[PDB]
């Protein structure tokens, strides 16, 4: 019963914006609040400004203390990575590079790793140092992770403070924060619950056939549902006219909204209540079975 | 006749689809998805919207944020009324094309119409009386709803991706109800007990 | 602009009747309107009424008496106009 079908594809380069949702890897949820210019971010002594300012007060309540240690370890991870970038920037020779990598891999306790750059190559070591410019990766199997001593030794191998807390500077004031602030390199995600797939409004659109209400869903211009408990919430309050208009004029009565929409344009703001057609349809279904029902009098 | 009047009461003579108990005139009234609780108490309404929550510290507690797109789509009948009086257009089709073109001469009009026009806000699990409030909106660029922090205690709403719906009252009776009772400043003690609700969290 | 309603609640010895009296006053102001009694601040007629109630010159007892006075004057004017039209041909 169909002749031919045609299909098209659409590509959207959807970028980041307020109202999205990002999270780490420990359940620390978050919704983007406001994107600030680069200068307003807190910046450390060497000019490099931070990119994410999280709220620490969600740490002791949700108890997910692992993310702080992840931040501390990740901060040390760039310490070797940045320093490697410093030597390679001034084209340091191979013997100074290779030995240094031999010092990074042999730290800690008697780990199962045993790497010897003395026996790979020269070009291969150069390529490996090339691939470590953005940060030396660190692996950690689940229930045997590095303790405080190992991460402290890794931090000290660079040129960073042992405690992992540095002093910042506010961009708005230029005044040093009186207490040290924890910074580091966190792995952060991006979730599909995007804001532009949720935001939708409706002035007036289509209408269902069996009973006169606006449809639902972001598709076909649906209208949000005045919930059953919202009726009770307004009922506890004193707004009677609001509820009357909400479930008589804007939703159901065909003579109501049609006459209301004519008045709303001419400066008039007066309702004309009628009879909800959903109740009328129900009346027929009550009269249909075997039982008489009707409105009594005027 | 038994199956028509009350299907599934005695013999379940359905044979509608592959193992599908079909409805009846009795089933279409009763139940969770019947007629009463589906389309007579909680009834879908016009002039509504839904979006994601976002905190804002720079705005006072009796006013809330609102994106340009949702406001322009919600207040379309209001835009037509004010534009016709000023004589920018003559027919409703011209005004609709003007809105569809989002020219620069409609943002100022929308700013004029929203100066003292409160809007409603509620969470999806409306549980108690304070689950619905009203605020005088302030137009802000973005795609979410900016909201004052303190009143977030009333909603028991965190910021992990919760969503809110907006409804707009129209008549003078409804707007006066909004300003007189629905506002955030008018509800600072809980109905349950005398403790405040604007407690710092 | 107005932030609270507490002054109007103090004036009229109930909160629910305030909505009705202010709605009647503001509807009279908007459609078939006359001049307001307070110098406006280019605000809508929704908030103009609440400013008048807290100013202590408009309430239900003042408004309905003013309505009776104006309708009596309008009926007297109608009678005078009818008599003048009848005497125009005479």
């Amino acid at each position: 019963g169909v002749l031919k079908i045609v299909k098209v594809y659409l590509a959207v380069k959807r970028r980041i914006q307020p109202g999205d949702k990002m999270a780490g890897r420990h359940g620390n949820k978050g919704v983007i609040s406001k994107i600030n210019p680069i200068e307003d971010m807190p910046y450390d002594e060497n000019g490099t400004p931070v990119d994410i300012v999280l709220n620490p007060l969600g740490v002791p309540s949700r108890m997910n203390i692992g993310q702080i240690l992840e931040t501390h370890l990740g901060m040390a991870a760039k310490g070797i990575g940045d320093k490697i970038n410093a030597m390679l920037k001034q084209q340091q020779e191979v013997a100074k590079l290779r030995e240094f990598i031999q010092r990074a891999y042999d730290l800690g306790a008697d780990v199962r790793q045993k790497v010897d750059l003395s026996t790979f190559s020269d070009e291969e070591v150069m390529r490996l140092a090339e691939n470590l410019r953005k940060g030396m990766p660190i692996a950690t199997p689940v229930f045997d992770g590095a303790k405080e001593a190992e991460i402290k030794e890794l931090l000290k191998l660079g040129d960073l403070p042992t405690s992992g807390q540095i002093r910042l500077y506010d961009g708005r004031t230029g005044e040093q924060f009186e207490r040290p602030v924890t910074v580091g390199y966190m792995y952060m995600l991006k979730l599909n619950h995007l804001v532009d797939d949720k935001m939708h409004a409706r002035s007036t659109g289509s209408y269902s056939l069996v009973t006169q209400q606006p449809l639902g869903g972001k598709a076909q211009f649906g209208g949000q549902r005045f919930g059953e408990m919202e009726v009770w919430a307004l009922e506890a309050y004193g707004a009677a006219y609001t509820l009357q208009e909400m479930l008589t004029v804007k939703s159901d009565d065909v003579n109501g909204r049609t006459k209301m929409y004519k008045n709303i344009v001419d400066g008039n703001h007066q309702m004309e209540p009628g009879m909800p057609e959903s109740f009328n349809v129900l009346l027929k279904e009550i009269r249909s079975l075997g039982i008489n029902i009707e409105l009594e009098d005027e | 006749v038994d199956a028509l009047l009350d299907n599934g009461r005695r013999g379940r003579a359905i044979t509608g689809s592959n193992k599908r108990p079909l409805k009846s005139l009795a089933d279409m009234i009763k139940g969770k998805q019947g007629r009463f609780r589906q389309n007579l108490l909680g009834k879908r309404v016009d002039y509504s919207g839904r979006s994601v929550i976002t905190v804002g510290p720079y705005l006072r507690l009796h006013q809330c944020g609102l994106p340009k797109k949702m406001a322009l789509e919600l207040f379309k009948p209001f835009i037509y009324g004010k534009l016709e009086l000023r004589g920018l257009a003559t027919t409703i089709k011209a005004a609709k094309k003007m809105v569809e073109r989002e020219e620069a001469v409609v943002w100022d009009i929308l700013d004029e119409v929203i100066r003292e026009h409160p809007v409603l806000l509620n969470r999806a699990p409306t549980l108690h009386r304070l689950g619905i409030q009203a605020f005088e909106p302030v137009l802000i660029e973005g795609k979410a709803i900016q909201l004052h922090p303190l009143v977030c205690a009333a909603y028991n709403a965190d910021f992990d991706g919760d969503q809110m719906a907006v409804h707009v009252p129209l008549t003078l009776e409804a707007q006066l109800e909004a300003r007189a009772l629905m506002m955030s400043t008018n509800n600072i003690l809980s109905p349950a007990n005398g403790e405040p609700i604007i407690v710092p969290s | 602009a107005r932030v609270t309603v507490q002054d109007a609640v103090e004036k009229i010895g109930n909160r629910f009747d305030l909505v009705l009296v202010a709605a009647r006053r503001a509807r009279q102001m908007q459609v078939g309107g006359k001049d307001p009694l307070v110098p406006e601040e280019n605000d809508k007629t929704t908030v103009i009424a609440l400013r008048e109630i807290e100013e202590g010159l408009i309430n239900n007892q003042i408004l309905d008496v003013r309505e009776r006075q104006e309708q009596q004057e309008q009926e007297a004017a109608e009678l005078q106009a009818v008599t003048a039209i009848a005497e125009g041909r005479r």
Partner: peptide
């Protein structure tokens, strides 16, 4: 006949249906 409408509802009950 609970909130604002109670004042209107009382007026109809006392003036009419009597």
């Amino acid at each position: 006949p609970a909130g604002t409408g109670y004042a209107y509802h009382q007026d109809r009950m006392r003036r009419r249906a009597a």
